Structure formats: C-alpha cells, structure tokens
Homo-oligomer: A and B are copies of this chain.
Amino acid sequence: LDKYSEALKDAQEKLELAEKKATDAEADVASLNRRIQLVEEELDRAQERLATALQKL
C-alpha cells in the first residue's frame, strides 16, 4: 500500500511537476512563440528597412 502510496505521492508530485514543467514549457512555447513572432516581425521590419536602405543606397 505504501509502495504504491509512495510511488503515488511521487508520481503525483512528479505529475504536478511535469504538469508544471508542461505549464512552463507551454508558457515558454507561448512566450517564445510571442518572441519568435516578434523577431519574425522585427526581421520583416529589418528586411523592409533593408530593402528601403538598399533602395536608398
């Protein structure tokens, strides 16, 4: 009962932590998706500014 209870408190805590890791990994997926998109948008802007600088050049 204890082998399972212990395995459970550990599986359950590991779950809360895996769920937390998932929460954080997902928070990071979302925070990075935001950041990736921000760098993609800023990249498009750098590329547009580059096309502009190159046309001005």
A interface list, Cβ under 8 A from B = 1, 4-5, 7-8, 11-12, 14-15, 18-19, 21-26, 28-29, 32-33, 35-36, 39-40, 42-43, 46-47, 49-50, 53-54, 56-57
Most buried by B among A1, A28, A36: A36
Residue among B24, B36, B47 making CB contact with A32, cutoff 8 Å: B36
Decide if B25 touches A29 in the complex (CB within 8 Å).
Answer: yes
Measured in the bound complex, the distance between the Cα atoms of B54 and A52 in whole Å is 9
Measured in the bound complex, the distance between the Cα atoms of B8 and A47 in whole Å is 53
- 24 of the cross-chain contacts (CB-CB < 8 Å) are A1-B4, A4-B7, A7-B8, A14-B18, A14-B19, A15-B15, A19-B21, A19-B22, A21-B22, A22-B24, A25-B28, A25-B29, A26-B29, A32-B33, A35-B40, A36-B36, A39-B39, A39-B43, A40-B43, A43-B43, A43-B46, A46-B50, A49-B50, A50-B50
